[PDB]
Write an enzyme that holds these catalytic residues in place. Structure first.
Site, mmCIF file in Angstrom:
data_model
loop_
_atom_site.group_PDB
_atom_site.id
_atom_site.type_symbol
_atom_site.label_atom_id
_atom_site.label_comp_id
_atom_site.label_asym_id
_atom_site.label_seq_id
_atom_site.Cartn_x
_atom_site.Cartn_y
_atom_site.Cartn_z
ATOM 1 N N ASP A 243 0.919 -1.182 0.077
ATOM 2 C CA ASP A 243 0.034 0.108 -0.117
ATOM 3 C C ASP A 243 1.008 1.146 0.131
ATOM 4 O O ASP A 243 1.735 1.252 0.678
ATOM 5 C CB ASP A 243 -0.747 0.174 1.244
ATOM 6 C CG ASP A 243 -1.983 1.150 1.362
ATOM 7 O OD1 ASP A 243 -2.554 1.077 0.414
ATOM 8 O OD2 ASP A 243 -1.883 1.868 2.313
ATOM 9 N N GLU B 166 1.476 0.413 -5.576
ATOM 10 C CA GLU B 166 1.143 1.917 -6.075
ATOM 11 C C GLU B 166 2.392 2.645 -5.798
ATOM 12 O O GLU B 166 2.485 3.101 -4.907
ATOM 13 C CB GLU B 166 -0.078 2.178 -5.546
ATOM 14 C CG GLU B 166 -0.056 2.136 -3.978
ATOM 15 C CD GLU B 166 -1.593 2.422 -3.598
ATOM 16 O OE1 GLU B 166 -1.723 2.119 -2.117
ATOM 17 O OE2 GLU B 166 -2.464 3.026 -4.136
#
Ligand code: CA
Length: 712
Positions: A406, A435
């Protein structure tokens, strides 16, 4: 807010500098020379500089000898007044890091004979371990300070089942906290728990995964996956649900484990399973939460367990779930949140070593690049150690197969490469990606584990937001449309994605190699593809929207790279238009197994696309170089893209493969690059049971994909 009464203030802001703050109305009284004092020591302090502040006058002092931590320090003013030397910014210096870095193990080291407790608290002056047990005697023992700022104490006896807390004394204030390395906790993670090894046996050995482009990722939340009344699973919303074999919906459609296996997915990515805040484990149905509120990184979340009160139970069930998935050829990816903690102020990190584990802006305030309150300072050596420690622990103790990081971009590259070395060594073949957003956190741009630096992070993958927006349409603008929704402006970007996003003509590479491109159009974040499209195409009927969503799946699934599917995407999952369902009700977040039955044919379509991909390596080239050698674009129009895979001698079962994606409901003819008869394997209607042969041209009727192949 009460506090210890002090004449004036003094902080160690660096290894040899002490900042003295004197209340304005005492400037003429509490004056220099200032001296540093400690048992066996009394030294002078040189004033490098002094200047006024809002309500205080400041003195930046220098000490001949570096400050010695672990002992209470007193600074005396010429007036005779004194105050205890408190902790300043010194904790975040490289010098401090190098002086106290500890390479040993931390936490509770259990033995049936005794347990050794260890906690890293270099800036503290005292520490103790507080032991408690249901209907038993509680005891609190002082810990001894050893080298590298580590406090420890050995407690004789079998401590299995004992609850423990650390008491750390920083700046003369004692704080109670759960062990940062707690591997078991009580209900709602209020206390840590010492447990003997559970002797778990992994009976489903799996060889290292072949290659990233060979994976098919399926993102799911443990509550969403089986909470639905028609899920067919008994342990609804619990770890054990996925252990249930051959489950089916009321109408007989496959569900649960059997369903996931049937889809052909290789890796099941789970939203946060470490202990988080957001759901009262005492009343799990009263609230919902994705789980991005980290409390304890080494312990499992309690709301997914049958019994959150028994410390060992949650561990046992998560391990069984993982082992069972493995028994069925399925691998597991853990969504991990090392970019921030829930409520920084009361976190184990902050209560143990104030100001060390979080990044601060130039003004001394906690940075907020994550947008949720704090940013973990991964670059600090004991933080980098923690993250690496945590990843290796989940691999070794829970035997998982990968991690989705994350807000990966919040972490620093050195930390990422350091944990990667340790993680891949402990488990060859694991998938590591996330990400790589470039966020406003206090790190030099080239040190952020962001997409832009992908070239320096081989072995690490990134969610391809470019390909996502190209196919679906910009995510920031509700109405914006992508190729699949009829926007020809993104046709080239789509083709680029189809080619692995490693460079396409004038388009700069997204990532160096296809193994680093996580291709997707839906995830737990933002509107689902169905809801998004429903806002962008308000005048299109369900039938056409379904064809567009199926089209987006074919584009991703037949694209070079690593395919990623959001659970429920296969059957047009909807969240009732909710954009960010992190805390929405189960009515919003549950996986709708009723919808799964209704669109069982569409689900079947994606199943065939997955089987197609698995049966043909042509779709799974392993390098940008190989792609440049076997993939070529044949047609690129606003609503039509045709590409082909060739020279597949020792690559694919088929000699040549042509794929045509049509994003308009009209009908058109398409000329093949030759006159050799091909097999019509699929068209907008779906896969053809008995592939008919076509020559020179082929009809492309409506929204969908047509696949032609030449055997050998
Ligand atoms: Ca919890």
């Amino acid at each position: 807010m009460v506090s210890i009464r002090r004449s004036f203030e003094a902080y160690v802001d660096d290894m040899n500098i002490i900042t003295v703050l004197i209340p304005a109305e005492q400037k003429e009284i509490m004056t220099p020379p200032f001296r540093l004092e400690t048992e066996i020591t009394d030294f002078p302090l040189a004033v490098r500089e002094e200047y006024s502040l809002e309500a205080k006058y400041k003195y930046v002092c220098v000490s001949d000898h570096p400050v010695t931590f672990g002992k209470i320090h007193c600074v005396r003013a010429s007036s005779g007044h004194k105050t205890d030397l408190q902790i300043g910014a010194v904790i975040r210096t490289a010098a401090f890091d190098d002086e106290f870095y500890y390479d040993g193990e931390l936490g509770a080291v259990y033995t049936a004979d005794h347990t050794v407790f260890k906690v890293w608290a270099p800036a503290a002056t005292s520490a103790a371990v507080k032991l408690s047990h249901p209907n038993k005697s509680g005891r609190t023992f002082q810990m001894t300070r050893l080298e590298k700022g580590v406090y420890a104490v050995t407690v004789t006896g079998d401590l299995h089942g004992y609850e423990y807390l650390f008491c750390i004394c920083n700046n003369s204030e004692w704080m109670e906290t759960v062990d940062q390395y707690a591997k078991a906790v009580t209900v709602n993670g209020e206390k840590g728990v010492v447990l003997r090894p559970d002797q778990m046996k992994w009976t489903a050995p799996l060889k290292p995964f072949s290659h990233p482009v060979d994976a098919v990722i399926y993102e799911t939340h443990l509550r969403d996956f089986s909470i639905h009344e028609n899920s067919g699973m008994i342990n609804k919303g619990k770890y054990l649900a996925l252990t249930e074999t051959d489950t089916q919906t009321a109408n007989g459609s496959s569900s649960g484990l059997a369903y996931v296996k049937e889809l052909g997915v290789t890796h099941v990515e789970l939203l946060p399973v470490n202990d988080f805040a957001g759901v009262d484990e005492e009343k799990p149905l009263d609230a919902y939460n994705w789980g991005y509120n980290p409390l304890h990184f080494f312990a499992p979340e309690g709301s997914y367990a049958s019994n959150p009160h028994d410390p060992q139970t949650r561990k046992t069930e998560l391990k069984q779930m993982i082992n069972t998935l493995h028994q069925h050829g399925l691998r597991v990816i853990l969504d991990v949140v090392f970019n921030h903690v829930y409520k920084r102020e009361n976190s184990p990190f902050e209560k143990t070593v104030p100001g060390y584990f979080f990044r601060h802006d130039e003004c001394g305030k906690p940075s907020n690049g994550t947008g949720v309150g704090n940013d973990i300072a991964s670059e600090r050596r004991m933080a980098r150690k923690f993250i690496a420690d945590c990843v290796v622990y989940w691999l070794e103790e829970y035997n998982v197969d990968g991690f989705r990081f994350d807000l990966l971009g919040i972490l620093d590259i050195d930390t990422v490469l350091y944990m990667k070395e340790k993680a891949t060594k402990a488990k060859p073949g694991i998938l590591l990606f996330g990400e790589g957003w470039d966020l406003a956190t206090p790190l030099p741009h080239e040190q952020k584990a962001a997409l832009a630096n992908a070239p320096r992070m081989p072995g690490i993958g990134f969610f391809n937001d470019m390909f996502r927006d190209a196919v679906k349409g910009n995510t920031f603008h509700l109405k914006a449309t992508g190729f699949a929704l009829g926007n020809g402006e993104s046709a080239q970007a789509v083709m680029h994605g189809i080619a692995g996003s490693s460079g396409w003509k004038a388009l700069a590479p997204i990532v160096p190699e296809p193994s680093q491109s996580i291709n997707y159009v839906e995830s737990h974040d933002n509107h689902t593809f169905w809801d998004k499209m429903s806002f962008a195409l308000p005048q299109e009927n369900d039938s056409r929207k379904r064809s567009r969503q199926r089209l987006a799946v074919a584009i991703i699934l037949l694209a070079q790279g690593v395919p990623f599917i959001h659970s429920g995407q296969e059957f047009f999952r909807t969240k009732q238009g909710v954009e960010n369902s992190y805390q929405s009700s189960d009515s919003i977040n549950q996986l709708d197994w009723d919808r799964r039955e209704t669109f069982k044919e569409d689900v079947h379509y994606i199943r065939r696309l997955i089987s197609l991909r698995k049966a043909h390596p042509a779709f799974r080239l392993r390098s940008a170089a190989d792609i440049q050698r076997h993939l070529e674009c044949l047609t690129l129009k606003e609503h039509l893209i045709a590409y082909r895979l060739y020279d597949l001698d020792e690559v694919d079962e088929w000699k040549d493969i042509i794929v045509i994606h049509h994003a308009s409901p009209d009908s058109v003819e398409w000329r093949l690059p030759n006159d050799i008869p091909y097999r019509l394997l699929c068209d907008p209607s779906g896969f053809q049971e008995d592939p008919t042969e076509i020559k020179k041209t082929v009809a492309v009727n409506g929204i969908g994909t047509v696949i032609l192949y030449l055997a050998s």
